[PDB]
């Protein structure tokens, strides 16, 4: 009885009611979808409110009076296709018509309203509607929708957990094998995601062995893997539209050396401490957490005795942010404030790292090594929930799977 994987048709209806509760009388909202360029990717604001996944379409939501029972939901679609009778019987549209009638259907709606919500600042239907609007007021709408998307419902949390569980078990199966080229490890993880139950990849992945791990945007993934190096991998799957995101690092030989042990433990110490902070009663913000992660890393660098190198402060050995919001997009809702306290229902990542250069000022057993560890965390009232907990990361658990399986 679901409409899309994990979401029922009743929740989609309740999302439209909540937005209408913030609009004045005589308003209409207009949203245009994407076109085929390639596997299709819908415009995510229109998908959040309807679940429709066909190209060349327009959605309109209208509020005639001050009562919530007079709302009207329109859809214009191409004539496998669902059709005019299917978009009402399955997707629950109040009115519908063919997309070829846009030049006569839309003007009748605009003329009888006072407020028009449209993002004036590329789809084919978008360029058409914008050309029409260049005693009424035009207003933006995209930022206002993002304040709803950042708080996940109990059903939304359950489908994100299933995608994180499938990706995490695939990592465990790769730990117990040996690979000699970056391309073989790449094609293995992709097949396990799909046969496990996911739809597709969530993003373009990283498979970087040896010195390749110093490039944050390395993507070629076609090099030979030596017996003396470690490898850094960043990849995950997606299901029903919702994304996951994971990072792990482990040695190619199957046993940690002494120098490899000391660097890995410094990164894992910071991550564990920051995850414990993710409680809504503490009143922390996302930027507060980033500031505390810088203070914790420089104490770890002092214990290693590598904190007084001329020209290499902490911002150059750890040169990126601590995390981001996660949802229908990988970098979800980037226009909300980083400086307000975190609320019950958000999902954020935690991913610190370290990267040592090839300079004589450092010990020879530390040059050209990079490490990163990342998980997905949901915020609760007086606790939290780790959505990717199946994938092991402790040193004793890692060596046990690599040697015994």
């Amino acid at each position: 009885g679901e409409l899309t994987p994990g979401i029922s048709a009743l929740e989609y209806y309740e999302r439209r009611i909540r937005l209408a509760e913030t609009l004045p009388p005589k308003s209409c909202v207009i949203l245009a979808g994407n076109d085929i360029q390639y596997p299709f990717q819908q415009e995510n604001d229109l998908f959040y409110l309807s679940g429709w996944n066909e190209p060349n379409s327009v959605m309109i939501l209208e509020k005639p009076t001050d009562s919530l029972s007079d709302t009207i939901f329109h859809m214009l679609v191409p004539p496998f296709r669902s059709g005019v009778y299917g978009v009402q019987e399955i997707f629950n549209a109040d009115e519908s018509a063919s997309i070829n009638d846009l030049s006569k259907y839309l003007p009748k709606i605009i003329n009888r309203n006072e407020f028009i919500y449209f993002d004036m600042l590329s789809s084919s239907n978008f360029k058409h509607i914008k050309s029409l609007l260049d005693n009424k007021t035009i207003k933006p709408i995209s930022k206002r929708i993002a304040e709803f998307r950042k708080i996940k419902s109990p059903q939304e949390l359950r489908i994100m957990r299933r995608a994180g569980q499938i990706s995490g078990r695939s990592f465990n199966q790769a730990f117990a094998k040996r690979f000699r080229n970056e391309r073989t490890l790449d094609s293995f993880l992709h097949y396990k995601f799909i046969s496990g139950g996911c739809d597709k990849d969530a993003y373009i992945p990283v498979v970087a062995t040896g010195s390749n791990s110093l490039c944050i945007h390395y993507t070629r993934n076609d090099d030979v893997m030596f017996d003396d190096e470690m490898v850094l991998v960043d990849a995950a799957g997606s299901l029903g539209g919702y994304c996951a995101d994971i990072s792990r690092t482990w040695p190619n030989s199957g046993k940690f050396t002494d120098a490899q042990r000391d660097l890995y433990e410094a990164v894992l110490n910071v991550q564990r401490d920051c995850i414990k902070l993710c409680k809504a009663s503490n009143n922390y913000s996302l930027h507060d957490i980033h500031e505390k992660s810088i203070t914790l890393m420089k104490q770890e660098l002092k214990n290693l005795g590598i904190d007084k190198v001329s020209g290499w402060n902490v911002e150059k050995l750890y040169p990126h942010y601590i995390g981001h919001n996660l949802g229908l997009d990988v970098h979800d809702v980037p226009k909300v404030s980083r400086y307000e306290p975190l609320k019950v229902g958000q999902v954020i990542t935690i991913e610190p790292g370290l990267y040592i250069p090839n300079e004589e000022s450092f010990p020879s057993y530390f040059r050209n090594v990079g490490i990163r560890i990342e998980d997905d965390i949901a915020i609760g009232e007086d606790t939290y929930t780790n959505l990717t907990v199946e994938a092991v990361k402790e040193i004793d658990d890692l060596e046990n799977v690599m040697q015994n399986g």
Partner: peptide, 4 residues
């Protein structure tokens, strides 16, 4: 991964 990382935003900035």
């Amino acid at each position: 991964x990382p935003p900035a």
